[PDB]
Design a protein around this ligand. Structure first.
Ligand SMILES: *[C@H]1O[C@H](CO)[C@@H](O[C@@H]2O[C@H](CO)[C@@H](O)[C@H](O)[C@H]2NC(C)=O)[C@H](O)[C@H]1NC(C)=O
Ligand SMILES: CC(=O)N[C@H]1[C@H]([C@H](O)[C@H](O)CO)OC(C(=O)O)=C[C@@H]1O
Ligand SMILES: CC(=O)N[C@H]1[C@H]([C@H](O)[C@H](O)CO)OC(C(=O)O)=C[C@@H]1O
Ligand SMILES: *[C@@H]1O[C@H](CO)[C@@H](O)[C@H](O)[C@H]1NC(C)=O
Ligand SMILES: *[C@@H]1O[C@H](CO)[C@@H](O)[C@H](O)[C@H]1NC(C)=O
Ligand SMILES: *[C@H]1O[C@H](CO)[C@@H](O)[C@H](O)[C@H]1NC(C)=O
Ligand SMILES: [Ca+2]
Ligand SMILES: [Ca+2]
Lengths: 447, 446
């Protein structure tokens, strides 16, 4: 007797939404923002800071979560998490609405940060880092970061179990969940995780010399082939964190009544993965993907084809979407084209929207920050490997924003495809940010 | 197996919060706004209009609802309602949070407006008006307004039944729920309702000549005793709605598995009630009250002691709170003192906070719009019949706002008293209004 989306959605959750080999990907564009039940709590005070949204929806229910800090976004002493478990439903008039069933404020003696959620058969699994020190400090402290695998059950109850980080993340100095949603695959919950490796440790040595250069489609890097390789090698040991190696990883835990059961860490060779960064494990149809935040020199949205075997994962040459850029700081700005060492960017993910009959991904939906360096102007659109469709803006005026996580689905009864685009938009009176669940219907020029 | 607030609240919901005969009412003041789980949905588009909040909380669960219009607050063609049923809970750290259990968007072929909710043993009872015409138009059409008694059950299901308005509101030209929350009393759900009476109908004739003047404490009306009486008589048949009589009423329906079972309308004599307006039926302890919006000449917050017998109600000389004023248009502005004909004001209710050991009400909490004519500057405070305590402002800058509905309770485990103040505040980017659940802890000097 577990909760399940209204019958109108059956067959429309987590599948390849648009199969077409003929049409141009960019002929599909988002509608004007749709008005629906806002399920994401806004701040209630002049300085409350709600940030870091994580979302995932299975074929049965959805999971959402965000961090809350009482005094401001800068304060690092303590915070709590908002957690929601729910199911998609429709009005008599066929309007959709995310109907949450368990709504809670998680607040105890611990400071959970960079939290990620996943919709598993047992509820809303969550992966957080319990931190006492700042990011800069955690990297310096050679000991791994404390992590916990929690879960909001259908009964509205929350249980968690700290992970044995001293053994699991033994070769790590710092480790955090990718904030983007995790995914449930073959009896296991998969989470994106990044952090810093202990220099000269087994895990660090194997990644030594390993690098890879991903380029821009239309642009070409003028730098010499030797300079570039030297730059790529160094983009993995950037300045910001004392030249430590920021590694990308994937943790899989067995979904059972025992939290933290059988955790297994996978560290993909850097011959394929760029510098570790926030991420998300997506599952669309039978395909799996790894979104990786563009924290390094690469600007275009990345999606590493992910395939699982047993308890480990394997990544492949990523899909890139040239028009889906993210603001960054020089020399890693939106229009950057050459390899370099940096740690900037912002989390704005791409949701697999349009596929080929052969099942190879063609296009994606997402909300990008349409700006070179400043986190400004959120713009929702559909993207292929090279161009961008018609867009939908939050405001024609310059607007401050941050992270965005998108997820598309179809109401089979109305035969309409929608994309939920959760975005951190600036606010007034009540806090620095208001995380708003934007909604668009995916349209096509003709029919 | 119905939902119930976490054990930390048992004994702290709907009771007299502060019993003290010694202390000055205004020594109790609200804290700085507290940060808690915002359970009220904000607009998701640049023009979505969320307005008209109604809230009520029983000893077991709470009910909330608001109207939503896609294009703007002005558009009257169609709209839907957001409905929530939930229970109060506490974090490990003792922070409170309204945890909703059933969250829904109610949208069908009908246009429900001016909706009111009440927490009954069967769920969240709702009273709405299904309208096709504008307010101005409804008053002109001699036929009563269509009403429905709905309910969001614990199972997350919504059922409703249209009321036989042609018989129930037979002597009425227009009728709407008071938007403020309704209350559950003696197996019946009680709703505040106002509207217009059919001229020369039985109900209208009895109210003819009936009036009453409520005055300001410190101020005195210069007008002659004859002019005032003539003005009071006319304040009941104001201009705005074609000189029709705007009457205040109270509808009670039996709470059962059959919606709309045994509806009974009570129309109190105007020798006690002012011109009909939005309202709320409050139940605090063993006492009952009727809040009546200051739509007429009276500015101070009103609370008519309400007593029930059988299926009808009876009102008594209202408690008035002189510092708890509401912005209005001349000559019925915040500082008005003389009887006059008008239909303005705004809904900003007072929640019974501090009582005497004898049980007579002494003070109330609420969020007033601190301004003479414009709906501006929300200010939360504690009030007695004459003064106002220290306040808590949403912003030091001039701020646009509208309705506010407050409800206080105590977390017995932490021995802290809180007041939830639901207020319509202006917004940017996403719609004209954002209905935010402000929260304050009631403090005392020392
Ligand atoms: C309990 O005592 C209070 C005062 O402590 C009573 O309030 C007074 O009531 C009389 C009634 O004639 C008024 O004249 C006074 O103005 C009231 N005093 C104040 C300070 O308000 C109250 O009436 C008593 N309870 C009841 C039910 O009568
Ligand atoms: C654990 C942590 O501090 N994460 C922070 C993240 C981090 O700086 C980046 O991923 C490089 O490590 O960036 C930002 C941000 O708004 O951009 C906010 C997060 O709280
Ligand atoms: C049924 C209806 O129209 N109610 C409206 C109400 C009404 O006009 C007033 O109570 C005079 O009767 O006023 C207001 C308002 O923001 O001021 C909002 C309500 O939508
Ligand atoms: C079809 O899929 C194959 C691999 O499965 C891929 O190489 C090809 O690009 C896809 N479609 C087209 C038109 O090439
Ligand atoms: C009443 O108001 C007057 C004029 O504003 C003021 O001077 C006086 O102090 C008040 N009187 C009392 C008894 O409060
Ligand atoms: C390639 O890059 C240029 C900028 O040099 C850009 O203006 C152009 O749109 C891109 N080509 C296509 C087909 O989009
Ligand atoms: Ca460390
Ligand atoms: Ca009518």
């Amino acid at each position: 007797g577990a909760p399940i989306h209204d019958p109108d959605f059956i067959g429309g959750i987590g599948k390849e939404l648009i199969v077409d080999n003929a049409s141009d990907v960019t002929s599909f564009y988002p509608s004007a923002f749709q008005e629906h039940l806002n399920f994401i709590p806004a701040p209630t005070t002049g300085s409350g800071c709600t940030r870091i949204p994580s979302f995932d929806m299975s074929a049965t229910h959805y999971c959402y979560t965000h961090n809350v800090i009482l005094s401001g976004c800068r304060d690092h002493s303590h915070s709590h998490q908002y957690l929601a478990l729910g199911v998609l439903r429709t009005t008599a008039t066929g309007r959709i609405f995310f109907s949450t069933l368990r709504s809670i404020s998680l607040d105890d003696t611990q400071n959970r940060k960079s939290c990620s959620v996943s919709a598993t058969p047992l509820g809303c699994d969550m992966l957080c880092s319990k931190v006492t020190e700042t990011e800069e400090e955690d990297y310096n402290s050679a000991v791994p970061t404390l992590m916990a695998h929690g879960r909001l059950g259908f009964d509205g109850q929350y249980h968690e179990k700290d992970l044995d980080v001293t053994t699991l993340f033994e070769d790590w100095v710092a480790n955090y969940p990718g904030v983007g949603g995790g995914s449930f695959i073959d009896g296991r919950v998969w989470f994106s995780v990044y952090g810093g490796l202990k220099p000269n440790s087994p895990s660090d040595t194997v990644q030594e010399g390993k690098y890879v250069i991903y380029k821009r489609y239309n642009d070409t890097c003028p730098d010499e082939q030797d300079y570039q390789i030297r730059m790529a090698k160094s983009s993995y040991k950037p300045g910001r964190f004392g030249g430590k190696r920021i590694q990308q990883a994937i943790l899989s835990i067995k979904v059972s009544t025992s939290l933290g059961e059988d955790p297994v860490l996978t560290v993909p060779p850097n011959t394929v993965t760029l510098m570790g960064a926030e991420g998300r494990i997506l599952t669309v149809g039978t395909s799996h993907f790894l979104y990786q935040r563009g924290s390094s020199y690469f600007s275009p949205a990345l999606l590493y084809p992910m395939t699982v075997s047993n308890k480990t994962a394997t990544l492949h040459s990523p899909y890139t979407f040239n028009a889906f850029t993210r603001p960054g700081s020089i020399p890693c700005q939106a229009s950057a084209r050459c390899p370099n060492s940096c740690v900037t960017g912002v989390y704005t993910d791409p949701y697999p929207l349009i596929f080929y009959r052969n099942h190879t991904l063609r296009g994606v939906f997402g909300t990008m920050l349409d700006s070179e360096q400043a986190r400004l102007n959120p713009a929702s659109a559909v993207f292929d490997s090279t161009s961008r469709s018609r867009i939908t803006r939050v405001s024609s005026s310059s607007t401050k924003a941050a992270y965005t996580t998108s997820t598309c689905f179809k109401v089979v009864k109305t035969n309409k495809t929608y994309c939920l685009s959760i975005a951190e938009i600036s606010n007034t009176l009540f806090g620095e940010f208001r995380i708003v669940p934007l909604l668009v219907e995916i349209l096509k020029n003709d029919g």
